[PDB]
């Protein structure tokens, strides 16, 4: 039984959420923001990522160098990531270094210089990041997958943004972005580990009290996405491994089917030939793939957003002549979510998830990321007992019902990268999304 997540608000509307663990000696405080690339339009796309770089480029008080030294002297580190819907800025430190870190975070978020000289310097650094993500094939596949699934919609935009925007981002539009979006009612200060809640609330009253409130304060995790069945093929015969993602429109964080989709995802499961145990997993697809050496790996995912999601699978394979079989068997395993699943698969997957959802949280940074993610997507931390109840409510009938409305005979977003000559055209892949025998 994990300790209680305490939650307080400030006057401006900043949420403070904390989960103490008096068994550890470090603490992760940070600010989770319900804002990300999705909050840009097409002209300022890339601003949110741009800001992340500039956040550490110095403030009105401390310069870039002073900032560096202040954090080095704290002992821990600062880290940030901008996703499509969420920006995070956290600071892992020692127990008694938490007042320093909250002070530094409050400074970089409120009182960032965004000096023309630094904008111009980072404009090259970020331009170079456009041609180095090129290597991270997983990310290339998923960036194309969002681009295609949500064609010309806010979720379809990348995080880095187009080259054109990076060249034209001004300190004005950066300032405007963080003034409009990084508002108190959209932020959560999270502490996990060796933090006292009452101490953290005092630190928030000291540092985050003069945060702007938005004109229209909506609840946290408040959003119109129209998924496009589509494919991108980025055939590259020189690459040895093919990476394929297939996804359908999945579920939002607040969907009634959110747990059903996670269960379904666990039924298909993950596989990685490099892990010893993976050849013995229960998953039907895992058995087919391992016996036939069809893939190096596959990883089911269910990415959720505030108002939509993608649910799908990401495959890697060196077996370039049997990619047809790999995709065929994968989609036939999804078909069986609609046609065949019974208590046998559902109860097995529920057991694996009942643990999985709690296993994930094994260090203060993971705990903070869980508190922060849940507070910015659902507006509350869901206790393990409630999570266990929602999973227990998922029946075999619910999974079949969900799969039949979400997977069966539905349009897919398919991205193939690499030596995918062997991947058939869109029709033949999409034809596997149903079974003529059923």
């Amino acid at each position: 039984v994990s300790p209680k997540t305490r939650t307080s608000n400030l006057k401006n509307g900043l949420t403070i959420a904390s989960e103490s663990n008096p068994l550890v000696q470090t603490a992760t405080v940070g600010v989770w923001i319900d804002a990300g690339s999705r909050n840009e339009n097409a002209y300022n796309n890339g601003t949110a990522h741009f800001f992340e770089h500039l956040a550490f480029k110095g403030t009105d008080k401390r310069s870039q160098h002073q900032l560096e030294l202040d954090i080095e002297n704290m002992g821990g580190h600062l880290n940030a990531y901008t996703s499509r819907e969420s920006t995070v800025y956290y600071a892992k430190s020692f127990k008694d270094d938490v007042p320093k870190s909250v002070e530094i975070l409050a400074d970089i978020l409120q009182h960032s210089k965004l000096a023309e000289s630094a904008i111009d310097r980072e404009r090259e650094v970020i331009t170079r990041e456009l041609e180095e993500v090129n290597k991270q094939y997983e990310e290339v596949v998923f960036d194309h997958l969002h681009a295609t699934a949500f064609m010309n919609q806010p979720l379809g935009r990348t995080i880095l943004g187009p080259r054109e925007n990076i060249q034209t981002i001004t300190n004005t539009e950066l300032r405007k972005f963080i003034t409009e979006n990084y508002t108190a009612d959209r932020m959560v200060l999270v502490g996990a580990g060796a933090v006292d809640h009452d101490a953290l609330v005092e630190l928030a009253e000291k540092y985050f009290s003069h945060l702007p409130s938005s004109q229209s304060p909506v609840p946290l995790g408040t959003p119109i996405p129209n998924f496009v069945g589509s494919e991108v093929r980025l055939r590259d015969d020189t690459m040895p491994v093919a990476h394929i993602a297939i996804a359908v429109e999945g579920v939002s964080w607040t969907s009634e089917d959110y747990y059903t989709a996670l269960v379904a995802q666990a039924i298909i499961g993950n596989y990685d030939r490099a892990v010893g145990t993976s050849r013995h997993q229960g998953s039907r697809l895992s058995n087919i793939v391992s016996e036939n050496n069809l893939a190096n790996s596959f990883q089911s995912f269910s990415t959720s957003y505030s108002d939509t999601g993608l649910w799908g699978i990401y495959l890697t394979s060196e077996n370039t002549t049997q990619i047809d079989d790999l995709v065929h068997f994968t989609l036939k395993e999804w078909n069986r979510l609609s046609t065949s699943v019974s208590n046998l698969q559902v109860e097995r997957a529920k057991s694996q998830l009942k643990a999985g959802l709690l296993l994930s949280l094994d260090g203060t940074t993971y705990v903070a990321e869980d508190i922060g993610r849940q507070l910015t997507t659902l507006g509350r931390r869901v206790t393990p007992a409630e999570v266990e109840a929602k999973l227990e409510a998922v029946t075999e009938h619910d999974v079949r019902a969900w799969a039949q409305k979400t997977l069966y005979d539905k349009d897919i977003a398919l991205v193939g990268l690499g030596p995918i000559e062997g991947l058939y055209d869109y029709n033949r892949i999409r034809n596997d999304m149903s079974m003529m025998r059923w």
Binding site: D143, H144, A147, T148, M151, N152, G156, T158, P162, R163, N226, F227, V228, G229, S230, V232, L234, E249, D411
Partner: peptide
């Protein structure tokens, strides 16, 4: 022309009620 994340224009063909 250059970015592969800018999906070509499909608006002439895309159905609004496709889902």
């Amino acid at each position: 022309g250059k970015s592969t994340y800018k999906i070509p224009d499909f608006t002439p063909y895309l159905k609004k009620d496709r889902n």
